[PDB]
Amino acid sequence: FWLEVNSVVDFFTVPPVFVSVYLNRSWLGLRFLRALRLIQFSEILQFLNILKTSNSIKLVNLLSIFISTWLTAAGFIHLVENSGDPWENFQNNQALTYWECVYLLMVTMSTVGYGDVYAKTTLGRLFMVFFILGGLAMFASYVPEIIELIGNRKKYGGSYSAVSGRKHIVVCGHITLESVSNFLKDFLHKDRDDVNVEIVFLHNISPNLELEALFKRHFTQVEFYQGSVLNPHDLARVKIESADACLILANKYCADPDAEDASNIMRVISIKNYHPKIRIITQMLQYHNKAHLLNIPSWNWKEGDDAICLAELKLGFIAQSCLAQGLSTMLANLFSMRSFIKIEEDTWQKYYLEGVSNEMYTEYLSSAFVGLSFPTVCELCFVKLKLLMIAIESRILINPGNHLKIQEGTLGFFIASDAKEVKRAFFYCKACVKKYDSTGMFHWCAPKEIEKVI
Amino acid sequence: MWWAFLASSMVTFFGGLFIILLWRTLKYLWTVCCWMTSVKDWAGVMISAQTLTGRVLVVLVFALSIGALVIYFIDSSNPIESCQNFYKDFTLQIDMAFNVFFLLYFGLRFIAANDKLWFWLEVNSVVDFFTVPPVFVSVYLNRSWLGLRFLRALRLIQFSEILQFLNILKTSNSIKLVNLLSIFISTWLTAAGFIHLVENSGDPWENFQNNQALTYWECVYLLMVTMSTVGYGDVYAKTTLGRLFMVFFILGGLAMFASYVPEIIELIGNRKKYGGSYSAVSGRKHIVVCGHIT
Amino acid sequence: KIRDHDLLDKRKTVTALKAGEDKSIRLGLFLIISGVVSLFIFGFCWLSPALQDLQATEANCTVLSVQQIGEVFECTFTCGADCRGTSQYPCVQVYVNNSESNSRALLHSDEHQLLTNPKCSYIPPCKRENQKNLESVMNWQQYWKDEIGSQPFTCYFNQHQRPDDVLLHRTHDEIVLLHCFLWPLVTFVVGVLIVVLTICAKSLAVKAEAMK
Amino acid sequence: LFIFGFCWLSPALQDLQATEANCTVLSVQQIGEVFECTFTCGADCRGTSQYPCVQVYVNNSESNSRALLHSDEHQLLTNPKCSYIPPCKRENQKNLESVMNWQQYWKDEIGSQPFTCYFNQHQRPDDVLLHRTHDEIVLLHCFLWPLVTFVVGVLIVVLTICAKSLAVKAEAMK
Numbered sequence A: 001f002w003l004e005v006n007s008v009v010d011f012f013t014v015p016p017v018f019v020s021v022y023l024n025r026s027w028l029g030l031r032f033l034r035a036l037r038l039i040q041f042s043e044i045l046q047f048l049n050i051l052k053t054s055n056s057i058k059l060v061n062l063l064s065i066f067i068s069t070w071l072t073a074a075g076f077i078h079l080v081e082n083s084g085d086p087w088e089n090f091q092n093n094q095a096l097t098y099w100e101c102v103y104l105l106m107v108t109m110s111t112v113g114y115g116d117v118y119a120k121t122t123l124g125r126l127f128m129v130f131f132i133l134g135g136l137a138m139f140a141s142y143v144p145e146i147i148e149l150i151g152n153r154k155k156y157g158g159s160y161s162a163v164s165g166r167k168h169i170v171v172c173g174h175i176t177l178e179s180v181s182n183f184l185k186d187f188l189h190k191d192r193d194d195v196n197v198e199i200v201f202l203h204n205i206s207p208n209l210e211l212e213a214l215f216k217r218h219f220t221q222v223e224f225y226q227g228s229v230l231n232p233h234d235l236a237r238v239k240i241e242s243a244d245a246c247l248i249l250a251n252k253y254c255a256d257p258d259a260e261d262a263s264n265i266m267r268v269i270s271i272k273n274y275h276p277k278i279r280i281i282t283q284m285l286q287y288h289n290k291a292h293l294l295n296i297p298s299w300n301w302k303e304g305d306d307a308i309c310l311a312e313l314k315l316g317f318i319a320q321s322c323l324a325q326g327l328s329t330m331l332a333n334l335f336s337m338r339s340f341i342k343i344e345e346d347t348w349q350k351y352y353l354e355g356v357s358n359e360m361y362t363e364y365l366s367s368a369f370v371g372l373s374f375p376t377v378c379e380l381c382f383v384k385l386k387l388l389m390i391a392i393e394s395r396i397l398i399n400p401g402n403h404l405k406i407q408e409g410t411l412g413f414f415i416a417s418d419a420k421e422v423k424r425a426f427f428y429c430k431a432c433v434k435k436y437d438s439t440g441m442f443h444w445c446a447p448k449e450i451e452k453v454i
Numbered sequence B: 001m002w003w004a005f006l007a008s009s010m011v012t013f014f015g016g017l018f019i020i021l022l023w024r025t026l027k028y029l030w031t032v033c034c035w036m037t038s039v040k041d042w043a044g045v046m047i048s049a050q051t052l053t054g055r056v057l058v059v060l061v062f063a064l065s066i067g068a069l070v071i072y073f074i075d076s077s078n079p080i081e082s083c084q085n086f087y088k089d090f091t092l093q094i095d096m097a098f099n100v101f102f103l104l105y106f107g108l109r110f111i112a113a114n115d116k117l118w119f120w121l122e123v124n125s126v127v128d129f130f131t132v133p134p135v136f137v138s139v140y141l142n143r144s145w146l147g148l149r150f151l152r153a154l155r156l157i158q159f160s161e162i163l164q165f166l167n168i169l170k171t172s173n174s175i176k177l178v179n180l181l182s183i184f185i186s187t188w189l190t191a192a193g194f195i196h197l198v199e200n201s202g203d204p205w206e207n208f209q210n211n212q213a214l215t216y217w218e219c220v221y222l223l224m225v226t227m228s229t230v231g232y233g234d235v236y237a238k239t240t241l242g243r244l245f246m247v248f249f250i251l252g253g254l255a256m257f258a259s260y261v262p263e264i265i266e267l268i269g270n271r272k273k274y275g276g277s278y279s280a281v282s283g284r285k286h287i288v289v290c291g292h293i294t
Numbered sequence C: 001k002i003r004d005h006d007l008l009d010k011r012k013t014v015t016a017l018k019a020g021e022d023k024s025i026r027l028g029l030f031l032i033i034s035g036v037v038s039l040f041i042f043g044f045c046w047l048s049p050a051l052q053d054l055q056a057t058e059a060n061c062t063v064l065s066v067q068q069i070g071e072v073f074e075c076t077f078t079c080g081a082d083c084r085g086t087s088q089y090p091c092v093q094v095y096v097n098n099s100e101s102n103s104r105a106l107l108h109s110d111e112h113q114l115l116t117n118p119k120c121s122y123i124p125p126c127k128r129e130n131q132k133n134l135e136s137v138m139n140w141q142q143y144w145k146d147e148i149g150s151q152p153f154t155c156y157f158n159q160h161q162r163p164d165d166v167l168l169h170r171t172h173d174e175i176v177l178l179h180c181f182l183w184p185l186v187t188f189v190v191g192v193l194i195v196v197l198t199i200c201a202k203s204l205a206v207k208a209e210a211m212k
Numbered sequence D: 001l002f003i004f005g006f007c008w009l010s011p012a013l014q015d016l017q018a019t020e021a022n023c024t025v026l027s028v029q030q031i032g033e034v035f036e037c038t039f040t041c042g043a044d045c046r047g048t049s050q051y052p053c054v055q056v057y058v059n060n061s062e063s064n065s066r067a068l069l070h071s072d073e074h075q076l077l078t079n080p081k082c083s084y085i086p087p088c089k090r091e092n093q094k095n096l097e098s099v100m101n102w103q104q105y106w107k108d109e110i111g112s113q114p115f116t117c118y119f120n121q122h123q124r125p126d127d128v129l130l131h132r133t134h135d136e137i138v139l140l141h142c143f144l145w146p147l148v149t150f151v152v153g154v155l156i157v158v159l160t161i162c163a164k165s166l167a168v169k170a171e172a173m174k
C-alpha cells in the first residue's frame, strides 16, 4: 500500500501544505502531481454507465494517460526551468509560465520545434533529452492499438431501439448481396401500401462490400444487426417478442442440402423456445425434411406458420408445364409485385407487359352472391366487375362444378390488376385389385423391381 | 460588439434555429392543448445536377465562390486602411453583386430540402450565414470587414461534382482522389484564414496592443511549414490565442493524416488498373486473342 | 431498345426527425461544452493580469515639485506608411506627495507610459521636428505649473509593487466583468436552451402522434 | 498571371495613387545633426562615416502646405528629416562637399522656376517626392510574359490538334 502510486501522489502534496501555514506562503513545489490522478476518469464514466462498452474504455485509458503525462511533465519543466541551476547561484533563471511549458512540450514531442521558446537551464536541457527519448519510446509502445481503434471501433450493431406504434419482421439465416436482393426489391415495392414494417436483419458474420451500399440505398428501413440467432440474449435485444413474423432464408447453392435444412430446423426451435406465438416463414431445400416442423409442439400451420419447400415447388412448376407449356412462367408472374407498363410499339412484349401486371389476391365476397352457383358468380365477377375468380374456400375448392352453391363468409381468390380493385367484390350490392393410394388422390401399382424397367 | 458585424451573422443563424424549433413545437402542441415545394425544388436539382438541363447553377455557384475568394485575397493584401480606399470602385460593388446571387440561391434551397431543421444544419447553409449578413452591414459604414469571408474556401469541396457532370472524372476510383485532394487544399486555406484573423488582431487581455503584423500568404506558408513538421521558426504565432489554435491544428493535422493514411487501396492498389477502351484505328484491321494467356 | 427504363415515384419524409434530431442535440452539447471551456480559458487567462490593476488603490494626492531633467529621450514618429524614423523630447518630472503614503512619487499618465519611461511624468505624441515635441511637453507642463499644490486630485497607487510611482488612470476599462462572464455564459445558456427545447419537441411528438 | 496580379498590384497601387503637382521652394536650412551612413570599400567593409542634414521645404501648388522635398521614397524612408542623402564616402570632407554641391543647386534657384513634383495626401501632407518609385516594368512585364506563355500554349495545342485531325483525313485520301 505504501508503494501504490496514488499513495506516493498524496505524500508529495499533503505534508508541504501543513508547512505552508507557518510562513503563510504558497510553495509551488509538487502540487502539479495532482494531475497524475485524473487517470481514474474511466472508472467514474464506468459507474455512471456512460462507458459501458468493453472496447471504448481502453481508448479513454490511453487518452487519459497522454493528457495526464503531458500536464505532469510540463510541471517538471516549469519547476526546473523557472528556478535556475545551483552552479550559477540560481542567477540562471529563464522567466517561463506554466502555459508556455505546456506549449513547449507539445511543440517538442510533435517534432515541430520552432525554437521561439526552449529550455536554457542546464538541468532543463537534461530533462528535455529524457522527455524526447521517453516520448518516442512511449509512442512506439502504444502504436500497436490499431486493434482497438481501426479493428474494433467499427463493430456496429447492438441495441435496436423499438419505435412504438409500428410493427416489424425479423429476417435471419443466410444473407448476402444476392440473397436479400430479390427479396428487398419486391418487399419494398412501390405498388403496395405504406406498409412500413421492414426495420431489421440478424446474422453473425459482418456485412461486406456492396451489401452495405444496398443497405445505405434503403437507409430508413433495414437497420442490420450483428448477432447469432441461437442466443436468447441476442433475440432479446432484437425485441423479437414484439415482432410480427420471423422470415428464415437458406442457401439453395449449398454443398450438402440435407445438412442445411436440418440445421435450419433448430433455428426454428431456438425462436419458438424464446417465444412460442410468433409466425415463422421458412424455406426448405429437400422435401422429406418438411415433416420435422410438425414435431415442434408450438408449430401450428393453422395460425400461419409455413415452410416453402424449394424442391417441391421447383419440380412442381416444371411438372405442371408438361401438361401445358408456359404454365411455369404464368404462375411465377402472379406472385412478384409488378407495375403496369405502356409500350407504344407492336412488338410481342407490348401484350406480355400487360399480362405481367396481374398479381393474385383474395377477399371475402359480398353477401349479395350467397346462394348462387359458382359459375354464375364467376360470370358476374368478370362481366359486371372486371375480376377473374379462380377458387373459393369449403377448404380450397378450385373451379367448383355448377352443383356447388356459395355460402356466407367464403373467401374468393382473384387474379386482378392491383389490391385496391378487389374490394369491389365485397362492396357489390344490387347497383347494376389395388389401383390408387389409401386416399384415392393418385395412381398406384404393386412395387416393381429395377431390372424390369431398365 | 465590433459594430455588430459578427452579431448580424450570429443572430440570423440562431434566430432561424429558434424559429424552426418554436414552429415545430407549436405545430404539434396545438393538437394536444385540447405546392412550390416540388415545381421549384425540381429546378433546384434539374437546372443544377442529375439531368443537366438548362445551365448548371452549381457551376455558377462554384465560379462566384472562387470570385469571392479572389476578392478576399485582394482585400486582405491591403493594410486595412478603412477610412478611405478605392473600394468606391468595383471591388466592393462586385462582391455585393455575388452576395445577392448567393442570397437568391439560398432562397431556392430553403423551400426544397423538406425538414428545415436538417437544412439549417447543412455545412453549405452555415457557410452562407457566416458571409451574407455582414456584407449587407458593410454598406452602412462603406468599409470591408475582413471577418469570415475566408469560409468561401470551405465550398470548393464541390469540385468533384462539376468534373463529374462534364464527364471528365468518369472513373469510380479517381473521384475519391479528387475528393481527398480537395479536402486538403480547402482545409489548408481555411485554417490559414483563422490564423490570419486571430494572429493579426491581437489578444483582448493586452487591450489588443499585442499585434504581430502578418499577411494571409504568410499564414498559408506558416501552416504548411508547420504541418510538414519542418518548422523553421523564422515566422510563428506570438498571440496567446494564436498559440492555442496552433496546438489544436498540430493535433488535428496529425489525427487527419492518420485517418487518411489507409487510402493506399485507392492510390497504390487500384490506380494501376489499366485497360478499358481500345481506340479503333480506322484503315487497319485486327484479330482478338482470348481464353487462357500466360 | 431499353424500353421506358423505369418510373419516377418516391414518397418519403425522413419519418419526422432523425438526422435533424441528432444534429440539433449534438450542436446543443457542443455549445454547452465550448461555453464551459471558453469560461475556463477566459478565467485564468484574464484574471492573472486583471488582479494587478484591481490590486492598485486610489487616493487624492497633491503636487510636490515640477522639473526639467535635460536628457533628450528618443521617440518614434510615423509618416502614415512604415517610417521607422525617430525624433526626441525633453524629460519633465512631476512629483506628488501621496495623500495616504505621504511619500515623494512621480506622476505617470498610465502604466504603459510608466513602463516606457519610468524617469519622466509625461510622454508627448511624437512628431517630426524637435520644436513640436518641445511645445507638446511645454503645453502639458503648463497645466501643472499653473496648478501646483492647489486642488488635490484623484490618483492610483500600489505599495505592494512600488512606493514611488503614481498613476492618473486605470489600465483596464470594464471590458473584463462585462465580457468574460458574458459571452461564454450566453453561449452555454443558448446551448442548454436548444437541448431542452429539442427534448421537449422530441418527447411531445410521440405523445401527439399517439392522440389519434 | 494569377500570382503576378495581387503580388504586383498591392505595392503598385501605392505609387499609382500618388499625385503630381508643380511646387516651389519655401526655405533651405542646415540642421546640425550629423547622421551616420555606411560606406563600402569594394569588399565587405561595414565601416561608417557621417553627413550634415539639409532640409529643403517646398510649398505645394495644390495643397499650399509646408513640406520637405525627398529624392525618392527610399530616401524618405531612410531619413524623413533630411531632403537629400549623399553617396556615402570615407572622409567627412567628401560627404560634406557632396551635400554642399546638391545644396548649391537649390540655393541659387530658390522659388524661381516652379517644378514638377509628386505627392499623396492620403498618406502624408508634409512630404514631397522628386521621382516615382516604380518604372513602367509593371504594365510592360506583368500583363506580358504570363500572357505570352498562355498564347504559346494555346497555339501549340491548336496547331497539334490541327495536324492530328488532318493526318487521318490525309491517310484516307488514297
Ligand SMILES: CC(C)CCC[C@@H](C)[C@H]1CC[C@H]2[C@@H]3CC=C4C[C@@H](O)CC[C@]4(C)[C@H]3CC[C@]12C
Pocket (backbone or CB within 6 Å): A079, A080, A082, A083, A084, A090
Ligand atoms: C533530479 C532533480 C529533481 C534535481 C533537483 C531539481 C529540483 C527538484 C530542485 C533542485 C534545486 C531546487 C530549487 C533551488 C532553489 C529554489 C529557489 C526558491 O526561491 C524556489 C524553489 C527553488 C527553485 C528550488 C526548487 C526545487 C529545486 C528546483
Ligand SMILES: CC(C)CCC[C@@H](C)[C@H]1CC[C@H]2[C@@H]3CC=C4C[C@@H](O)CC[C@]4(C)[C@H]3CC[C@]12C
Pocket (backbone or CB within 6 Å): B002, B197, B198, B200, B201, B202, B204, B208
Ligand atoms: C474562440 C475564439 C474565436 C475567441 C474569439 C477570437 C476572435 C473570433 C474574436 C475575439 C476578439 C475579436 C477581435 C477583437 C477586436 C478586433 C479589433 C478590430 O480592429 C478588428 C477585429 C478584431 C481583431 C476582433 C475580431 C474577432 C476577434 C478576433
Ligand SMILES: [K+]
Pocket (backbone or CB within 6 Å): A111, A112, A113, B229, B230, B231
Ligand atoms: K523539425
Ligand SMILES: [K+]
Pocket (backbone or CB within 6 Å): A112, A113, A114, A115, B230, B231, B232, B233
Ligand atoms: K525546427
